[PDB]
Amino acid sequence: SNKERFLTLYHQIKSDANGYFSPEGIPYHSIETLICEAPDYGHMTTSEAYSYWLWLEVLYGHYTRDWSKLEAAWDNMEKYIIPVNEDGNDEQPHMSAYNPSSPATYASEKPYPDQYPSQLSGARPAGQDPIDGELKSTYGTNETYLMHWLLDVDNWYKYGNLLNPSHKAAYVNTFQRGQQESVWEAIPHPSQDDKSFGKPNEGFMSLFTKENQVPAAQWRYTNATDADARAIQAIYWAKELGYNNSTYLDKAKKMGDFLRYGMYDKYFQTIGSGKQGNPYPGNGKGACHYLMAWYTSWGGGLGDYANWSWRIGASHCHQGYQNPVAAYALSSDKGGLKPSSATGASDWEKTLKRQLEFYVWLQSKEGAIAGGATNSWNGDYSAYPAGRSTFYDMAYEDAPVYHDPPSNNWFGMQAWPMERVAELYYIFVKDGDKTSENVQMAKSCITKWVNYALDYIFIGSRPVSDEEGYFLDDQGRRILGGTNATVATTSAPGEFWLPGNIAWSGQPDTWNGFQSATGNPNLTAVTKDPTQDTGVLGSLVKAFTFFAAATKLETGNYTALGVRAKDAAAQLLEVAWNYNDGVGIVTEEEREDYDRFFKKEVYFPNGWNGTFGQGNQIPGSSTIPSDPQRGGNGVYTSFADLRPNIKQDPAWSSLESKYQSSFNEATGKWENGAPVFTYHRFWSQVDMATAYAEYHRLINL
Ligand SMILES: OC[C@H]1O[C@@H](O[C@H]2[C@H](O)[C@@H](O)[C@H](O)O[C@@H]2CO)[C@H](O)[C@@H](O)[C@@H]1O
Ligand SMILES: [Ca+2]
Ligand SMILES: [Ca+2]
Ligand SMILES: [Ca+2]
* Count of other CB atoms within 10 angstroms of residue 64: 12
Instruction: Measure 36 CA to ligand 1 centroid, in angstroms.
Output: 9
**Residue of minimum CA distance from atom 22 in ligand 1:** 38
Provide CB contacts within 8 A for 88, sequence distance 6+.
Answer: 164
Q: In degrees rounded to 5, what are phi and psi of residue 51? A: -65, -40
Query: After which residue numbers is the chain interrupted with C–N beyond 2.5 angstroms?
Result: none
Provide CB contacts within 8 A for 130, sequence distance 6+.
Answer: 284, 285, 288
Written in H, E and C, the secondary structure of 31-63 is: CCCCCCCCCCCCCEEEHHHHHHHHHHHHHHHHH
* Count of other CB atoms within 10 angstroms of residue 27: 25
Q: Which ligand is nearest to the CA of 321?
A: 1
On whether 180 is known to bind a ligand per the annotation, the reply is yes
Q: Which ligand is nearest to the CA of 404?
A: 3
Distance from C-alpha of 179 to C-alpha of 540, rounded to nearest angstrom: 28
On whether 404 is known to bind a ligand per the annotation, the reply is yes
Pair 6, 682: CB distance under 8 Å:
no
CA 365, 369, 375, 376 dihedral sign is negative
Look at the chain and count its residues. Answer: 701
Distance from C-alpha of 29 to C-alpha of 383, rounded to nearest angstrom: 39
Instruction: Measure 38 CA to ligand 1 centroid, in angstroms.
Output: 7
Which residues pair with residue 461 across a beta bridge?
491
Q: Is 668 left (phi over 0), alpha (psi -120 to 50) or beta?
A: left
Find out whether the peptide bond into 405 is cis, omega within 30 degrees of 0. Answer: yes
Instruction: Measure 406 CA to ligand 4 centroid, in angstroms.
Output: 44
Task: Report the atom number in ligand 1 closest to the C-alpha of 409.
Answer: 11
Instruction: Measure 413 CA to ligand 3 centroid, in angstroms.
Output: 20
* Count of other CB atoms within 10 angstroms of residue 34: 19
Q: Reduced to 3 states, what is the DSSP secondary structure of residue 662? A: helix
**Which sequence positions are flagged as catalytic?**
48, 226
Q: In degrees rounded to 5, what are phi and psi of residue 52? A: -60, -40
Task: Report the atom number in ligand 1 closest to the C-alpha of 679.
Answer: 16
Domains detected in the chain: 1-82+123-147+223-294+313-586+679-701 (1.50.10.10), 83-122+148-222+296-312 (2.170.160.10), 587-678 (no CATH)
On whether 91 is known to bind a ligand per the annotation, the reply is yes
With 0-12 / 13-18 / 19 or more C-beta atoms within 10 angstroms meaning exposed / middle / buried, residue 158 is middle
**Residue of minimum CA distance from atom 6 in ligand 1:** 37
Pair 127, 268: CB distance under 8 Å:
yes
b/e map 560-598, b = 16+ CB within 10 Å: ebbebbbebbbbbbebbeebbeebbbbbeeebeebbbbb
Using CB distances shorter than 6 Å, the residues near ligand 1 are: 37-38, 48, 410, 412, 533, 535, 681, 684
Distance from C-alpha of 694 to C-alpha of 690, rounded to nearest angstrom: 6
Task: Report the atom number in ligand 1 closest to the C-alpha of 591.
Answer: 13
On whether 529 is known to bind a ligand per the annotation, the reply is no
Distance from C-alpha of 73 to C-alpha of 63, rounded to nearest angstrom: 17
Structure determination technique employed:
X-ray
Task: Report the atom number in ligand 1 closest to the C-alpha of 684.
Answer: 17
Q: Which ligand is nearest to the CA of 247?
A: 4
**Which is nearest to 426 in space by CA: 333, 327, 551?**
551
Provide CB contacts within 8 A for 673, sequence distance 6+.
Answer: 658, 662
**Residue of minimum CA distance from atom 19 in ligand 1:** 37
CA distances from 574 to 43, 494, 583, 668, 701 (A): 31, 9, 17, 39, 18
Of 31, 35, 37, 594, the residue with max ligand 1 atoms within 8 A of its CB, to mutate for a pocket test, comes to 37
CA distances from 189 to 183, 284, 363, 686 (A): 13, 35, 38, 29
DSSP secondary structure, 555-568, as one string:
HSS--HHHHHHHHH
CA dihedral 4, 5, 7, 11 (to 10 degrees): 140
- Give strand ranges (E) for 412-478: 458-463
**Which is nearest to 604 in space by CA: 209, 207, 197?**
207
Distance from C-alpha of 480 to C-alpha of 168, rounded to nearest angstrom: 50
State the distance between the two ends of the chain, measured CA to CA, in whole angstroms.
Answer: 12
Q: In degrees rounded to 5, what are phi and psi of residue 443? A: -65, -45
On whether 487 is known to bind a ligand per the annotation, the reply is no
On whether 563 is known to bind a ligand per the annotation, the reply is no
How remote is the C-alpha of 4 from its chain's centroid? Answer: 30
With 0-12 / 13-18 / 19 or more C-beta atoms within 10 angstroms meaning exposed / middle / buried, residue 599 is middle
* Count of other CB atoms within 10 angstroms of residue 437: 13
**Residue of minimum CA distance from atom 1 in ligand 1:** 38
Distance from C-alpha of 222 to C-alpha of 488, rounded to nearest angstrom: 45
**Which is nearest to 116 in space by CA: 379, 300, 490?**
379
**Which is nearest to 612 in space by CA: 190, 38, 300?**
190
Strands 218-222, 192-193: parallel, antiparallel or unpaired by DSSP? antiparallel
Pair 405, 411: CB distance under 8 Å:
no
Distance from C-alpha of 664 to C-alpha of 78, rounded to nearest angstrom: 47
Provide CB contacts within 8 A for 463, sequence distance 6+.
Answer: 456, 471, 487, 488, 489, 497, 530
Q: Reduced to 3 states, what is the DSSP secondary structure of residue 479? A: coil
Triad 76, 82, 88: Cα angle to 5°: 80
Written in H, E and C, the secondary structure of 277-338 is: CCCCECCCCCCECCCCECCCEEEEECCCCCCCEEEECCCEEEHHHCCHHHHHHHHCCCCCCC
Instruction: Measure 249 CA to ligand 4 centroid, in angstroms.
Output: 9
Distance from C-alpha of 261 to C-alpha of 132, rounded to nearest angstrom: 9
Run of H or E residues at 547: helix 534-555
Pair 344, 242: CB distance under 8 Å:
no
Which amino acid does the sequence have at 409? Answer: N
CA dihedral 465, 411, 692, 450 (to 10 degrees): -90
b/e map 400-433, b = 16+ CB within 10 Å: bbbbbebbbbbbbbbbbbbbbbbbbbbbbbeeee
Q: Which ligand is nearest to the CA of 71?
A: 4
* Count of other CB atoms within 10 angstroms of residue 326: 33
Q: Reduced to 3 states, what is the DSSP secondary structure of residue 172? A: strand
Of 46, 150, 401, 410, the residue with max ligand 1 atoms within 8 A of its CB, to mutate for a pocket test, comes to 410
**Residue of minimum CA distance from atom 2 in ligand 1:** 38
Instruction: Measure 184 CA to ligand 3 centroid, in angstroms.
Output: 8
Distance from C-alpha of 528 to C-alpha of 484, rounded to nearest angstrom: 15
